[PDB]
Design a protein around this ligand. Sequence first.
Ligand SMILES: CCCCCCCCO[C@@H]1O[C@H](CO)[C@@H](O)[C@H](O)[C@H]1O
Ligand SMILES: CCCCCCCCO[C@@H]1O[C@H](CO)[C@@H](O)[C@H](O)[C@H]1O
Lengths: 509, 764
Amino acid sequence: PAKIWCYCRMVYMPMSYLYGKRFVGPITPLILQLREELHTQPFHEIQWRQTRHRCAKEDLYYPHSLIQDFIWDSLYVASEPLLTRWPLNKIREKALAKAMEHIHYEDENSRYITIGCVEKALCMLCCWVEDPNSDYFKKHLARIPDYLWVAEDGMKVQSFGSQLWDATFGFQALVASNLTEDEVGPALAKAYDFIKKSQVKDNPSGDFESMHRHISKGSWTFSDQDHGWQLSDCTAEALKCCLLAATMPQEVVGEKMKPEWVYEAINIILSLQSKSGGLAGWEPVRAGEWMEILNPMEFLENIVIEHTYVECTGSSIIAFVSLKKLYPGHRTKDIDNFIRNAIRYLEDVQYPDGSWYGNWGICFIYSTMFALGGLAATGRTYDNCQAVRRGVDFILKNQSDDGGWGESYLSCPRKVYTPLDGRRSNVVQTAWAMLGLLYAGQAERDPTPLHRGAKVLINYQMEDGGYPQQEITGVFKMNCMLHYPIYRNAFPIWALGEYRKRVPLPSKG
Amino acid sequence: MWKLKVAERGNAPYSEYLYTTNDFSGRQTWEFDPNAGTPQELAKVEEARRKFTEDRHTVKPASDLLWMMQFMREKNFKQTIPPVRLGEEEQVTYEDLTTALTRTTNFFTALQASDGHWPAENGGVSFFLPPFIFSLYITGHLNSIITPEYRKEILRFIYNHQNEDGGWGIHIEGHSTMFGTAFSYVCLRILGIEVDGGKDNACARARKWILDHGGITYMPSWGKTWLSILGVYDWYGCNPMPPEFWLLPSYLPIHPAKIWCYCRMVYMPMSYLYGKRFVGPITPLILQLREELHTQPFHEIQWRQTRHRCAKEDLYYPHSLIQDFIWDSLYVASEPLLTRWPLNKIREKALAKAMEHIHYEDENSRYITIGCVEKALCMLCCWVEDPNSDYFKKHLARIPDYLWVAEDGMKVQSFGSQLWDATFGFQALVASNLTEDEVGPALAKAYDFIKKSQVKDNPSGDFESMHRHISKGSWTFSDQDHGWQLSDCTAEALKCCLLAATMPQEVVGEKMKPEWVYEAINIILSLQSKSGGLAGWEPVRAGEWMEILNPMEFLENIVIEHTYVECTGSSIIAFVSLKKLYPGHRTKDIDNFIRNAIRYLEDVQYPDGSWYGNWGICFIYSTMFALGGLAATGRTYDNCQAVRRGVDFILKNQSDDGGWGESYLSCPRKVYTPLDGRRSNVVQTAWAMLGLLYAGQAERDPTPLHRGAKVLINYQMEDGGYPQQEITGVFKMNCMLHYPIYRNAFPIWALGEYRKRVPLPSKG
Ligand SMILES: CCCCCCCCO[C@@H]1O[C@H](CO)[C@@H](O)[C@H](O)[C@H]1O
Ligand SMILES: CCCCCCCCO[C@@H]1O[C@H](CO)[C@@H](O)[C@H](O)[C@H]1O
């Protein structure tokens, strides 16, 4: 269990307990009258041993391997005839007790706001079937209304919080944009104090070490401080925000953080790193890529084991480069080595077409922006450099009739980069492309394409404010999708803030 | 008193009469004449021996000079042309290049053209000869087969290349290995030579290196398995390899029809030997030699916990945790069961199936099976079953087909390479301009041999559904007597045939029928992967996760095959060349295959602008083939994807005079270290020039090409050829190979197209 991914470990463990207990819910009169219409054959007059392997051709993304199917088939006859009529009392009871105590130790440290709606829902049943009358069940029931949400359509369910990530992105956009009226100072302070208060500093309760978990010291979460989960992606943006706000005057933004807490964040970031370059999100490395053969699901990919993410590597390298300007005072001979290790990783992930796709945003250029931002930091030029011109040429070759950029939700799963969505464009994707191209120093090279890129943004501006474009603009594990409501405004303002700073574009009137 | 002569002895050559397929089409044999002698020519042998003995440190390999010496009397050309030398950036004209070609081509084509090819050699690594010595010692025919005059030659071969530090190498240019050192010491000691401490008899020197490395328990699994048969090691100290893997309905994920052919044909005799638990007789030499080797008493040590002790010098691919756990579980699953209470039915059926599979395989292979080690092990496998038979005698009869002699002592040739080198030489000759036009008879005398070298008959018996692939009009790497499909040689053979097809009939002779090429095209199209490219023997079996079960630790990617870039480039250039002659077979399929293969080449490219190969030791060896296969589909240079990367990589890396060089350790480390003293080699420079030429850089900027051509004329010998001696070959990223004719085949090929591409006008 100390080898598999954290999400799979915390999801399948309640599944393991439920399978071991063979728990079946009460058969209400609705169940008996509804179980007949679903199945095309009679409910109890069918077979089940040979019906286990029937995969649909519509929901099949990663088919099972021969070895995996053979292992499951062997285990079916190894376990069911044994641990159902003559169950090993000692082994099964110890396994159930260990699962129960692990779930109890995990939920207490997670403050009952555990990762995933499905995982929390399954854990609620797992703890209810053990003791319907307790306090853990009541506290789990109390945090249920923390996930429901309302929109233009009916009520929906929010998988997890994202206030910290969007707040950091908005703060970075605001500070990058020129303070014209300078009245954003109070809002910047009222967000900075919240950001400071959002830092997770306490260790998980109990013996977190040697319990299939990693050490957390001054780390950041993705949802809120109440969770207490280390994630290198959000920490890299938080450190950049803190460093950029550090140089701002004290009299305008307020007090500043102590310079000793950043060392813990640097140590945590350096803790997560692979042997060939880059870093993962939660754990550095467990095993090889051959562990994915045992994937139970068929509509996802790369779930059992983690992998290195290019966006996190780019954010970490740009954060480390930004730190050098302020003060070099911690492991001068180690940060340079880490940067050298990370530099060669970015070149490997590049595809021959000149672009490499990400893992969270639905685009072949979403990770390109972060890579270009993290590549120009180490002095990578454009006239004479390796792999820098490939992304620029890829971006230039692919545009709309008016210079816009667009893709489709099926582009990433097929890994083909199909932009045929009607030759349309979106504000978020165009802003991402412009920001990525800006880090390459193309403003002084040839800003003529940038003129239409900026002009295709002003028309989409609403008189009431904001941009009315509505798209998911997010992917999850190459099959699932995600939506962000503030990306419509956060990124265009960020791009327009640096558009004037890079190229003055003089015009008296 | 050694004369090199074609065999022509199909009726009882040494001990048993054998059967040929095309009247000994290229059979290689060597005989020690009893009455040969010359007052002055025989004196050259001592000079050849002493030159290598004194320049072993500076030059590790040795080109075959005594072999080509014998052909100087048979063809007394006596040509006198000084080596043309140009300096101070003087532009060369057609005259100097034509003179150099006239001097370096006539003797090359007169070296050997009677049969239709040139005798080539592999790379002497001193790795598979101790198996032959052990086999001959265990069969009792060592005295009958190995004459005493061969003993001094093999002793000199062993002594000529020995590391002064004590630790030998896996290949000729190795450094501080345990397998090679131990095997060489055992083979030298078992042939009746005592223990001394001199420079010639360096047993005492090797004692210090053997003893200070934890005995002989740090050698790889092959060494332990081999010494367990000779009464030196114990079966409990190695890993279990049950012979029951061949009993399955071929539905399990691991079946013999899934693993590579070489591994399947090598480990099967190992499986039989492990199942039978056969141990050779303990001669008085064995008991007196088993004590000095081990640092502890022979029988007073443990073996169950000594199975996992890997040396830090001969470790390239460490074992995985799952593999070690599987072996540990199998050790207690099989040994307590199938040793004291063996399953009679299962074990007997497994042994019978292994025996019948070996017998069916050797008959179809004409007893010239792949690999010296595999043949040596199969000889023991068939001898322990029936010491008095005909298969054993016929195996014993083909033993002298592998021994070879060079400037150093007698060596062993792993496999034949006459067809590959003959095709390369023919391609070079036809690409070079026919100045005197007298190469026509030699071209015909090689073309008829090439036509006769085609394998057309199916393997005897039910070759299909026997873990083998269909062969129809295929080509082998060694000779037609083998009958093994290989897409690499077929691609070059088809190009040679197509290029010779457009030549006039009156000058080269008759031509092949246009119906046989369809079978070759079908065979080539049969081998292809689902993502692009193709393998050598089988299209695809499983994924890349099968390599976790690798038993060896000094190699990599042995259990399963892989796609080779060089073969893909050769196939695509052959297919493009075929379109010019006549499109008449699957017009909608060849284009699809080319489209599939095009995208494969882009993927294998490294970010540095170059991708290394698998057979030549260079990061640019595969680059030449890729560039040759990429410019065929209209890939330009000014505006194209990935074409400029290789050109920039080649331009950025040069010598002080524009030369190119690498090191044997560059490919294993995948770093492309050229720091060999900033030197260069003729073969590598010719490869680089040929690869750059396909990119159309002759009209772009031929200024770098001037020095690239000039650094070649100086290396030209007045007697002909180039004296540079390097292996210029790699095998599975750890082993090395040598080619003796690459010194001449490639420079002439480059010079032939140098004048054709850029005229370089100069009136005088
Ligand atoms: C200490 C040794 C106890 C011997 C078996 C106890 C009697 C049966 O006990 C049961 O046996 C079944 C099959 O083994 C399983 O259900 C469990 O082992 C156990 O509950
Ligand atoms: C149908 C079962 C017959 C007996 C199987 C015993 C377990 C297999 O084991 C083998 O069986 C041989 C034949 O009995 C015996 O020589 C030994 O028990 C053992 O070698």
